[PDB]
Amino acid sequence: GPHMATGQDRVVALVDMDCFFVQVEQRQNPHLRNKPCAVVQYKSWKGGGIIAVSYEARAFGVTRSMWADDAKKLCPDLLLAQVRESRGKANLTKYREASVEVMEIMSRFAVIERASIDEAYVDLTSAVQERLQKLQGQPISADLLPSTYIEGLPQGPTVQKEGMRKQGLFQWLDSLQIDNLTSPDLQLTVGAVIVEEMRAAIERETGFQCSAGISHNKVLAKLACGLNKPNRQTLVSHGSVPQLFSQMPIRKIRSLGGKLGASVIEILGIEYMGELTQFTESQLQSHFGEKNGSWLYAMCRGIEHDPVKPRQLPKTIGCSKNFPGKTALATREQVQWWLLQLAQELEERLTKDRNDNDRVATQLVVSIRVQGDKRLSSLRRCCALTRYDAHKMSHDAFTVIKNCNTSGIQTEWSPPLTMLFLCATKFSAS
DNA sequence: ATAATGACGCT
DNA sequence: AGCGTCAT
Ligand SMILES: Nc1nc2c(ncn2[C@H]2C[C@H](O)[C@@H](COP(=O)(O)NP(=O)(O)OP(=O)(O)O)O2)c(=O)[nH]1
Ligand SMILES: [Mg+2]
Ligand SMILES: [Mg+2]
Numbered sequence: 001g002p003h004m005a006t007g008q009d010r011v012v013a014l015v016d017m018d019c020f021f022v023q024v025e026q027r028q029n030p031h032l033r034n035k036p037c038a039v040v041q042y043k044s045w046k047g048g049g050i051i052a053v054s055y056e057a058r059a060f061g062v063t064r065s066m067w068a069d070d071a072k073k074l075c076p077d078l079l080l081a082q083v084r085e086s087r088g089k090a091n092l093t094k095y096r097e098a099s100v101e102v103m104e105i106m107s108r109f110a111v112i113e114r115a116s117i118d119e120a121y122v123d124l125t126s127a128v129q130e131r132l133q134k135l136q137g138q139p140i141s142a143d144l145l146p147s148t149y150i151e152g153l154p155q156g157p158t159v160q161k162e163g164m165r166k167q168g169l170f171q172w173l174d175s176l177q178i179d180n181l182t183s184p185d186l187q188l189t190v191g192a193v194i195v196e197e198m199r200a201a202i203e204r205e206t207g208f209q210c211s212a213g214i215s216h217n218k219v220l221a222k223l224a225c226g227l228n229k230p231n232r233q234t235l236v237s238h239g240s241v242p243q244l245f246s247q248m249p250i251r252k253i254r255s256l257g258g259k260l261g262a263s264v265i266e267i268l269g270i271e272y273m274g275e276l277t278q279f280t281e282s283q284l285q286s287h288f289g290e291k292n293g294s295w296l297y298a299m300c301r302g303i304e305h306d307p308v309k310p311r312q313l314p315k316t317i318g319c320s321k322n323f324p325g326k327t328a329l330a331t332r333e334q335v336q337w338w339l340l341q342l343a344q345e346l347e348e349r350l351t352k353d354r355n356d357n358d359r360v361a362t363q364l365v366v367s368i369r370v371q372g373d374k375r376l377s378s379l380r381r382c383c384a385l386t387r388y389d390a391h392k393m394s395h396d397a398f399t400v401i402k403n404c405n406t407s408g409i410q411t412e413w414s415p416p417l418t419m420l421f422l423c424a425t426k427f428s429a430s
Numbered sequence: 431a432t433a434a435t436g437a438c439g440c441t
Numbered sequence: 442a443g444c445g446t447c448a449t
Contacts, residue, residue: 016449041433049433064449065432083433090434116436116449258447291439316436324431380443421435439446 007216007303008184008238011191013122014221015106015198017210018230020118021052024098025081027207036060037079040068041090047072048082055230087341089321092117101206103312109198113308121218122198123308128190132181135190139178142169144193149228152240172235185237188214192235199233217304219254241302245274253299260292276300313357318423319346320367328371328416332405335413335420336398342422343394350388350424360430361385366397367421368404377421379404385424397422 017023021039026032036057040048047068060075072078084091099117106112106120113121153168177183195212203209212233213224223244224236236244250273251261265271267287268279276284277300285293298304319342329335354360364385370378381400385393407414 020449045431049431051433063432067431092434117434119449255447260446314436318435320434322431322433327431375445377444382442423435434449436448437446438448440444441442 005303006184006238007298007301007305009125010216011124011128011187011214012217012221012308013124013191013195013212013214014115014218014225015120015122015195015210015212016225017102017118017208019052019054020098020208021083021095022054022081023208024095026054029081032079032081035079036062036075036077037081038062038068038071039083040080041083042085043068043082046070048080051083087345088338089319089341089345091345098206098208102202102208102210105202105205106198107312108201109194111308111310112312113310114312114314120312121221121308122195124191124194124214125187127194128187131190131194132187137179137181140173140176140189140193142166142173145169145173145189145196147196147199147232148192149232149234151224151227151234151236152243184216185239188216188235188237192233195233216302218306218308219299219304220302222254223248223252238302242274245300245302246272248273250276260288264288264296273300315427316365316423316425317346317349317353317361318365318421319343319349320419320421322369322419323416324418328418329413329420330416331412332410335417336394338420339394339397339422340390342420343397344390346393346422346424347388347390354388354430358430359427361424361427363424363426364393364396365421365423365425366400367419367423368401368417369419370404371416371418373418377419393422 022037025039026037037054038050038057039052040050042048050066050068050071051064053062053064057075057078062071062075062078068080084094095117103112103114103120106122110127111123115121148169149165150168150172153171154164158164176186176189178186180186192214195214199210199212209231211225211229213221213236214233215221215224215236216238220236224234227234249271250265251257253273276296281293281297284296323329329338350361362385363382365380365382367377367380383396383400405413
């Protein structure tokens with residue numbers, strides 16, 4: 001109608017590093033480049049757990065969380081890089097540092113929200129606005145968009161992928177309304193031009209390739225990112241949403257991958273995101289709550305308002321290690337020693353954070369899991385973090401959890417702990 | 431024995 | 442405060 005908002009107010013990108021840990025190891029070791037390759041944690045149990053996979057290895061069926069011994073059965077030529085181990089635990093510093101390389105480059109173009117170690121959202125709205133004045137209503141050349149797919153195009157009236165890519169791009173650019181500096185489709189297009197530029201800059205300055213989604217919000221941007229991978233970017237326009245959503249499994253949409261997604265499917269008897277449009281906002285709210293219902297009602301029409309938060313730095317700093325199976329910690333001395341290994345890594349990172357980013361954590365969260373409980377955390381307790389000292393932090397953590405030891409003999413520890421987790425939080429400016 | 435983290439909602 | 446969800 002004449003008053004309906006169409007969720008076309010922003011230009012948002014989601015940039016995701018293609019098999020990131022593998023790229024970091026391949027940059028460092030040229031012998032691993034353009035080879036079936038994976039990154040592995042902990043060599044000893046079944047060759048190690050695989051945590052990142054090159055696209056050459058994926059084609060053999062190698063996946064994350066697969067044991068390396070098992071992936072070698074699928075892919076005998078598979079090359080492996082091992083994650084650094086410090087103080088008896090996986091240490092991800094190399095990938096954190098590579099990540100900062102990428103996020104600093106992206107920060108030159110626009111406002112970014114760090115989403116994970118290898119993903120960031122980009123609010124390109126302002127950047128596009130200014131680019132559109134620089135562009136005298138000039139046509140946008142296909143040459144400015146050499147790795148961009150236009151989702152849903154080509155339509156109607158070739159046999160190779162790049163064939164199809166440029167046909168869709170041509171149909172899109174031929175149709176564009178470049179006189180109108182307010183057309184959402186033009187804005188997205190200009191957004192796509194800037195993300196090409198950002199991705200060229202990242203590759204030139206780090207050697208890392210990545211993929212991107214460009215759309216009007218974060219959920220659509222994230223979804224778009226995954227449509228054409230690797231080293232490609234996808235524009236998802238508002239107009240493309242009805243066809244895209246009509247066969248889009250509900251669980252593919254960000255935040256609908258877990259329990260809420262499954263109950264949407266089971267309570268409503270539907271499979272695809274677009275089927276949600278039949279329901280009133282009140283019906284949706286009555287099944288899933290006021291906030292979830294409102295969000296679904298707007299999302300299945302391609303509309304979502306979660307802002308890109310200007311936050312390039314993590315809000316918590318944490319250290320964690322699982323002790324599965326027979327390795328579960330069963331004695332007081334073990335528990336203490338590992339709390340100390342965690343606290344030491346933590347102090348390193350905290351101190352580094354206090355020098356690099358001018359801030360100071362003030363609360364220490366202590367999380368454990370007990371044997372048999374399959375919840376992530378069996379128990380969470382906090383205490384003050386007054387001093388970046390590894391021995392104080394570990395002793396404090398021991399203190400606030402020790403009474404979970406139900407054992408009679410207190411040389412031993414029951415029930416066995418299957419996880420330790422130290423998280424520094426509640427940062428103050430320093 | 432699908433890790434090591436991280437952000438946020440509910441009460 | 443502490444637990445639950447969702448995610449890479
Ligand atoms: N230990 C562990 N690390 C993981 C896992 N999954 C991801 N990581 C670590 C390692 C990853 O390199 C990195 C990024 O995660 P993604 O973006 O979800 N996948 P990637 O970047 O590998 O490939 P692409 O994006 O092209 O699909 O975070 C896992 O299951 N376990
Ligand atoms: Mg990635
Ligand atoms: Mg990612």
